[PDB]
Design a protein around this ligand. Sequence first.
Ligand code: CA
Ligand code: CA
Ligand code: CA
Ligand code: CA
Ligand code: CA
Ligand code: CA
Ligand code: CL
Length: 466
Amino acid sequence: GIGTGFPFDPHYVEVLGERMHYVDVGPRDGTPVLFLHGNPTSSYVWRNIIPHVAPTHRCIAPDLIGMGKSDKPDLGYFFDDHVRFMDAFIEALGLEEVVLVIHDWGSALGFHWAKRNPERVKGIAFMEFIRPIPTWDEWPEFARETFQAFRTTGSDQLTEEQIAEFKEAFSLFDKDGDGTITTKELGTVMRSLGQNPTEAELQDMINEVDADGDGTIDFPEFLTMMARKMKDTDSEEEIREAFRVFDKDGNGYISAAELRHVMTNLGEKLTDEEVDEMIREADIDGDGQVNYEEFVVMMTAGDSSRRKFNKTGKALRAIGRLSSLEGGSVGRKLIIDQNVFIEGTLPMGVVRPLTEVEMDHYREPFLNPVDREPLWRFPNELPIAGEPANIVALVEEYMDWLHQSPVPKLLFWGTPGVLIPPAEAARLAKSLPNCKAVDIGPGLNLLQEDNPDLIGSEIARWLSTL
Ligand SMILES: [Ca+2]
Ligand SMILES: [Ca+2]
Ligand SMILES: [Ca+2]
Ligand SMILES: [Ca+2]
Ligand SMILES: [Ca+2]
Ligand SMILES: [Ca+2]
Ligand SMILES: [Cl-]
């Protein structure tokens, strides 16, 4: 009967203009034991391990910024964001000597902080920590296809001039060449095409595909929107809508003046006789106009004026695709909207079935879809296949620090595991200094939920070694 209650007095502290939350129970003197959680949990993952440590040693378990009960500022929640907030939080409490019990992304925070302050770390307990992996073949194949979906957004085999066609469509919006599409500069062409959305609608279309966190639209974010998922009918609403932009009078034909207007409304070079040559490749029945079925031809096909037309067609199609509010990153819609990281990824991290009262505590901090930004930034920050480069070099530095650090190290592993397999858990037991490895038997990622009895057991005995 594994307990699920959370009977800890909550404490709060402001850090960098935002407020954070932490548990603080235990004797007030000695060396504090700092618990650091990872994705997608909070302090709730340490609820049945603190009682094994709380009597003898002080236990501090904060929730990361934008998670648990800490404040949720509008940030990208990169790893460097958590470093800045955890750095100022540790010094806000005036801590010096510290013992670290870390897991998942909390281990990346604890180890990186220990490398920069090695004279202030008395002991490190850890399990399923962040490690560099060279190939996707080393990542467990049960979650290899899914964790790719969080990071396979954009660059879906777009080659030749396809990237060069979207960059010309990207040029229709960027008049100041800032590389980013301003929330007003988008509306500058929305008004220029006969429309006029609200400011709420203007930024809502950007809040769908802003993975950078700039609040604006990037070109890599412009590519992930233009996916090749061409449903025969569901994608007919955007080409038909592209036809409505030209056909203003609604008679069913695109006039030469209707064609020249929207193109010259934006930045294009078409005089009175520069538009007749693309009428040739469009007008096939000879009526001097372009109907609907002739229009889908040019939108599905020497680029004298073909370059000019296909350029705008890409931009006009992105307008209708932005208005769909479904042109976001595929990995984002899994974690943000559909919330697959709490509904599917989190339970698959524990081999035993989590209870409804248990997982309900995990849904609590992320009841708003917009507040799930760190839930999606964390998997994209994983050092996998040498990407991201800044994270790989960062984790490969505190691992080089850990190989030579004489501090006591307590490692917990399980079978089959996710981040630390049994094969790697055996090498770390024989390669790291002062390292004793404890096997919990069955275990994946959240080793705290499978055997919280054993985790707090060996830690308690390991605490009294210093
Ligand atoms: Ca711009
Ligand atoms: Ca951006
Ligand atoms: Ca940018
Ligand atoms: Ca017309
Ligand atoms: Ca025609
Ligand atoms: Ca959405
Ligand atoms: Cl993750």
